[PDB]
Amino acid sequence: MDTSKLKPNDPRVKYETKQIRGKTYSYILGEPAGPKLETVVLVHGWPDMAFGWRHQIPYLMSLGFQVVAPNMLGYAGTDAPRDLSQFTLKSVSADIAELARSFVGQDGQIVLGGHDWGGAVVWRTAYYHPELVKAVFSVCTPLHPLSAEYKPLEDIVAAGHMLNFKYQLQLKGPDVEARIQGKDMLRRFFRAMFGGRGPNGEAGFSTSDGVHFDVLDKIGAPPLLDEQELEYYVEQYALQEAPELRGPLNWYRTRELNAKDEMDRAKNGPPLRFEMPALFVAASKDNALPPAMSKGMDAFYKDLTRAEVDATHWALTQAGDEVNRVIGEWLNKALG
Numbered sequence: 382m383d384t385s386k387l388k389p390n391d392p393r394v395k396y397e398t399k400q401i402r403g404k405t406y407s408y409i410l411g412e413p414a415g416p417k418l419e420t421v422v423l424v425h426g427w428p429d430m431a432f433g434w435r436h437q438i439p440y441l442m443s444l445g446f447q448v449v450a451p452n453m454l455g456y457a458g459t460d461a462p463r464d465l466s467q468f469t470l471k472s473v474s475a476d477i478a479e480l481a482r483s484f485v486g487q488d489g490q491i492v493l494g495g496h497d498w499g500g501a502v503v504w505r506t507a508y509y510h511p512e513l514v515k516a517v518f519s520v521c522t523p524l525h526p527l528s529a530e531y532k533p534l535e536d537i538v539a540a541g542h543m544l545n546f547k548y549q550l551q552l553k554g555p556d557v558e559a560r561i562q563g564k565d566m567l568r569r570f571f572r573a574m575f576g577g578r579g580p581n582g583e584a585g586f587s588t589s590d591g592v593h594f595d596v597l598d599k600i601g602a603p604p605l606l607d608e609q610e611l612e613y614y615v616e617q618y619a620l621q622e623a624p625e626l627r628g629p630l631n632w633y634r635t636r637e638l639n640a641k642d643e644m645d646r647a648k649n650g651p652p653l654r655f656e657m658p659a660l661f662v663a664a665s666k667d668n669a670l671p672p673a674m675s676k677g678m679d680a681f682y683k684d685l686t687r688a689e690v691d692a693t694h695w696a697l698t699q700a701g702d703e704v705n706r707v708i709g710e711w712l713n714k715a716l717g
């Protein structure tokens with residue numbers, strides 16, 4: 382079995398859809414080499430897609446795992462509902478549970494893995510659906526406690542707090558959705574998000590201000606995507622109806638809806654408490670999700686393995702071989 386990363390439209394995997402909780406979900410499905418050990422479900426974040434797991438998918442297949450990597454709500458071939466309540470962490474966790482059980486049966490279990498917003502999804506999925514999740518891991522995204530209060534992010538950052546998330550104000554508003562439309566702008570956006578730079582070192586993205594629109598036309602080739610990977614992201618994002626980023630950006634519009642869900646759990650539901658084997662892979666150079674943010678995370682876990690790779694936010698690809706090894710060795714211990 383060939384273990385190198387997926388290429389665009391790689392024939393080693395299948396590309397399918399299923400109706401899941403009223404929505405069409407598209408996904409990558411890779412079948413195990415050998416008798417199946419487990420089914421692994423992998424969950425990307427923003428602005429990624431299932432292909433963001435292209436280093437992990439064939440690796441995990443070669444280890445004996447069936448792999449299901451959906452394009453998440455809003456992305457590529459998956460529906461983008463207009464109703465923001467579909468985008469909450471609880472509703473998307475329920476989508477993941479139904480999709481998982483459509484492969485493993487209602488009584489089955491999965492290994493669950495996430496990155497970025499997907500990392501937040503998978504911790505919530507393990508909390509909402511402990512019947513289903515046998516082991517869970519996240520790259521970059523630490524646990525965050527159940528919301529006990531709702532405060533507008535504008536007020537939080539105006540008091541000088543959570544300043545690494547201030548870019549979420551721009552993303553939640555109209556500017557990015559209105560300006561990044563069509564394949565020409567999508568192409569410049571992805572050159573920016575995957576590290577391309579301008580003639581005087583201009584960056585296309587900052588955690589303080591979000592997308593730097595006025596440098597996008599000067600951004601050069603991204604070091605973290607090759608030319609056909611970049612065009613694949615453009616083509617797949619162009620599957621969404623214009624404005625193409627409405628779906629992905631809806632992940633920034635749910636702070637109040639998620640707070641409503643989680644204030645109820647903070648007062649009446651069970652505590653945030655993970656009894657199943659868990660792994661957290663921090664990324665040293667992620668400015669949006671810095672390792673120090675994982676502070677007192679260990680207190681919420683019976684069995685948390687920690688790792689840290691020296692990589693940017695795009696650790697799944699930039700450090701794909703290292704992340705694969707960390708996951709495989711942890712999974713081997715967790716399952717054995």
Ligand SMILES: CCCCCCCCC(=O)NCCCCCCCC(N)=O
Pocket residue numbers: 426427428497498501522523524525573574575576586669693694695
């Ligand atoms: C822990 C609190 C709850 C989870 C919050 C997760 C926030 C996810 C998110 O907003 N990710 C977007 C980052 C932007 C990529 C940066 C590209 C530029 C580059 N790295 O080259």
